[PDB]
Write a protein that binds this ligand. Sequence first.
Ligand SMILES: *[C@@H]1O[C@H](CO)[C@@H](O[C@@H]2O[C@H](CO)[C@@H](O[C@@H]3O[C@H](CO[C@@H]4O[C@H](CO)[C@@H](O)[C@H](O[C@@H]5O[C@H](CO)[C@@H](O)[C@H](O)[C@@H]5O)[C@@H]4O)[C@@H](O)[C@H](O[C@@H]4O[C@H](CO)[C@@H](O)[C@H](O)[C@@H]4O)[C@@H]3O)[C@H](O)[C@H]2NC(C)=O)[C@H](O)[C@H]1NC(C)=O
Ligand SMILES: *[C@@H]1O[C@H](CO)[C@@H](O[C@@H]2O[C@H](CO)[C@@H](O[C@@H]3O[C@H](CO)[C@@H](O)[C@H](O)[C@@H]3O)[C@H](O)[C@H]2NC(C)=O)[C@H](O)[C@H]1NC(C)=O
Ligand SMILES: C[C@H](Nc1ncc(C(=O)N2CCC3(CCOCC3)C2)cn1)c1cnccn1
Ligand SMILES: *[C@@H]1O[C@H](CO)[C@@H](O)[C@H](O)[C@H]1NC(C)=O
Ligand SMILES: *[C@@H]1O[C@H](CO)[C@@H](O)[C@H](O)[C@H]1NC(C)=O
Length: 461
Amino acid sequence: DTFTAAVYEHAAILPNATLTPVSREEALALMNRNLDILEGAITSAADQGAHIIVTPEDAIYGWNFNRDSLYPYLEDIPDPEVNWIPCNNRNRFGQTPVQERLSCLAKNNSIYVVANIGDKKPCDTSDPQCPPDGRYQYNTDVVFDSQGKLVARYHKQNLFMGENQFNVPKEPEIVTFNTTFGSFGIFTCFDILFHDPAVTLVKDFHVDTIVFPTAWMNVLPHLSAVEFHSAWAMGMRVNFLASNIHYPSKKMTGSGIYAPNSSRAFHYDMKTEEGKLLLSQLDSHPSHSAVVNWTSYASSIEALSSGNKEFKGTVFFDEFTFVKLTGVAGNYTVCQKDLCCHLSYKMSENIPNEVYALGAFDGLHTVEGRYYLQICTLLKCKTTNLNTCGDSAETASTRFEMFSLSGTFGTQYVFPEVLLSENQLAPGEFQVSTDGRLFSLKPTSGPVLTVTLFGRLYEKD
Ligand SMILES: *[C@@H]1O[C@H](CO)[C@@H](O[C@@H]2O[C@H](CO)[C@@H](O[C@@H]3O[C@H](CO[C@@H]4O[C@H](CO)[C@@H](O)[C@H](O[C@@H]5O[C@H](CO)[C@@H](O)[C@H](O)[C@@H]5O)[C@@H]4O)[C@@H](O)[C@H](O[C@@H]4O[C@H](CO)[C@@H](O)[C@H](O)[C@@H]4O)[C@@H]3O)[C@H](O)[C@H]2NC(C)=O)[C@H](O)[C@H]1NC(C)=O
Ligand SMILES: *[C@@H]1O[C@H](CO)[C@@H](O[C@@H]2O[C@H](CO)[C@@H](O[C@@H]3O[C@H](CO)[C@@H](O)[C@H](O)[C@@H]3O)[C@H](O)[C@H]2NC(C)=O)[C@H](O)[C@H]1NC(C)=O
Ligand SMILES: C[C@H](Nc1ncc(C(=O)N2CCC3(CCOCC3)C2)cn1)c1cnccn1
Ligand SMILES: *[C@@H]1O[C@H](CO)[C@@H](O)[C@H](O)[C@H]1NC(C)=O
Ligand SMILES: *[C@@H]1O[C@H](CO)[C@@H](O)[C@H](O)[C@H]1NC(C)=O
């Protein structure tokens, strides 16, 4: 059994903003301007045979808000158990025009629709956890099945820096929906960097596929959307539908359809202002059985290089211990604290004025979010100057005939990243071994920007 997956990257119409909160009518008009565009993508996807379509986080109202300015955009989204088709019973829960339209879009096009909107939950001064505002406001994913029925509601657990317009639920919501084309899990944006609910859906609830509305700000060399989201799908052995906001001025671009084996379709564009609809086939029940011990090989072998010239380099405000790669071929080992990284490589030719380095990082990230990292990276240094290794580099000229990366990871959550010039994925030019080695299967189709083993130690957060 297979199915056709669709994702839409959306150039959103943002509200004029801000000062005084708009009226419901002004809020609704903006939301309908965005919905008219999403309607175009949903209908085409459905006409092209897609069983499900994911639309981005904040796609209907954007991201510039405080609690009071956000309020007029919010609807009380009921509990999915309530058994409701808003397209067939429009006023069951009072004034709900957005839910009604999303329900009709899914129903009239006979397709599952995943969208991100805002939930309002009025509360009284009685419960202590109730805000002085008189309500809870949540960043909410809604899922409508092919008949227009609300089948899932997910309130984002992991809020980002300055997302002050929203609340966090007391307990993480582990939201799943079952279909004739697999079991589906859902989470949003920054959730992909945490354990709850992301890891739990995969490891405990055994979902086949994740639907992921995102409004992702790209941070090279490891946290470009297409790169990290496909790495997480590969590391977690799950299908993954990433639907992102298109806003190049904020480095927002990178939607795709990912399988456990490799990427299946992807989109990156920093040049145009246009959205993009992607479609691709996937297995309904892929194999999740291909287990990897990430420290196996690396903890068995001895250092591949001795007494080398090592230097400190900054990668996304994190201080990595690096080792320059000298020669068209080599074997290097570099360590930082409990982590030892090993690389075996051979370039297609040595390109002049292009420096590559092997980096190790074992520590806590703190800038704009706290999370514990263990990273082994083969990266293209931005320039020939070693103090530029770990800086955001978008192009490279060095292809590689072979690579084999590994590390002494103190975690089972390691995401394998392969990123080519210019922010292009490499399907299926690489594989991961049961030993925890990220290695090439052919010479790379294009020049390499990075080959990384991105590990998360959730317990040390
Ligand atoms: C989400 O929805 C899914 C889909 O509906 C639910 O999964 C279904 O659960 C049913 C109940 O447990 C399963 O029914 C039993 O099936 C076996 C036959 O084995 C299957 O053969 C199928 C046809 O070839 C095949 O689709 C199926 O799935 C595959 O399983 C293999 C592993 O073997 C895996 O590799 C694949 O990826 C895929 O999952 C199996 O191979 C029957 O023997 C069994 O017996 C009957 O019991 C009935 C009573 O329940 C009775 O009517 C009858 O007389 C027999 O005694 C059941 O019919 C069904 O296989 C399974 N489908 C899939 C695709 O998983 C899932 O439970 C839902 N989850 C939640 C949380 O709600
Ligand atoms: C993944 O592979 C590694 C390597 O085999 C596994 O880690 C190893 O786990 C064993 C336990 O089975 C550890 O042994 C212990 O050694 C210490 C002394 O050093 C002591 O407490 C005991 O003598 C015990 O035998 C071993 O040290 C450890 N190695 C490392 C580097 O952590 C790992 O658990 C495997 N995981 C799976 C699920 O396959
Ligand atoms: C690389 C990664 N990118 C990232 N992380 C998180 C969010 C996120 O959750 N957003 C939610 C809505 C959003 C609020 C800010 O304005 C825009 C819309 C962005 C977006 N991009 C990252 C991680 N840690 C620090 C910095 N960046
Ligand atoms: C869906 O169809 C119903 C009638 O079939 C119609 O009233 C409604 O406007 C349609 N909605 C959309 C957004 O297609
Ligand atoms: C790297 O290691 C492999 C395996 O030991 C070896 O075949 C290869 O020649 C080495 N290359 C260099 C340049 O050290």
